[PDB]
């Protein structure tokens, strides 16, 4: 037999993520003293659409 | 088929006719230290799978009957083979 489509998916040649116009990694900020024992205030500059 | 024990037949060691006890011969326990078994175990070791033929086309349904006629007074054992029989029994 051949190699099925699920096998060819794990090599990542044409199945790589199409992430060129993505905004970036979306996550909390890195933990520090000011988040452990205080509060840091942030300003929501804009709301954007992540592809 | 049916053959009694306690036969009176010739015993070569005593050179005389003595009473003899008759039983049936059963194949003994296969040993793990005979040369043929040691050779076979060595060959089967390693890759290659089954290295010796395996019989799978049996056709016979019966076996020849071998009696073990044993001298009572001298322990001298004979081996008499009978014809193939479906049913065998050691009678009186």
């Amino acid at each position: 037999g051949r190699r099925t489509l699920s096998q060819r998916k794990g090599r990542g040649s044409i199945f790589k993520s199409r992430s060129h116009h993505k905004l970036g990694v979306a996550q909390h900020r890195a933990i520090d003293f000011f988040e452990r024992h205080s509060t840091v205030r942030g300003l929501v500059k804009s709301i954007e659409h992540d592809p | 088929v049916v053959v009694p024990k306690t036969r009176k037949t010739y015993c070569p060691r005593c050179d005389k006719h003595t009473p003899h006890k008759v039983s049936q011969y059963k194949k003994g326990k296969d040993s793990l230290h005979v040369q043929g078994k040691r050779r076979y175990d060595r060959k089967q070791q390693g890759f290659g799978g089954q290295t010796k033929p395996v019989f799978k086309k049996k056709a016979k349904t019966t076996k020849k009957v071998v009696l073990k006629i044993e001298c009572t007074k001298c322990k001298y054992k004979l081996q008499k083979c009978l014809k193939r029989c479906k049913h065998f029994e050691l009678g009186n």
Partner: protein, 41 residues
Amino acid sequence: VDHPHGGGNHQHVGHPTTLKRSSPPGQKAGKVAARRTGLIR
């Protein structure tokens, strides 16, 4: 050649589509370690 489901003179599977979790990659096609099948009630 392409798939385990690749059938013959009638489009059909042929063997059960529920498979063990331990199936090698290549034959693990369909429902995997399925505790149940059919429409749920």
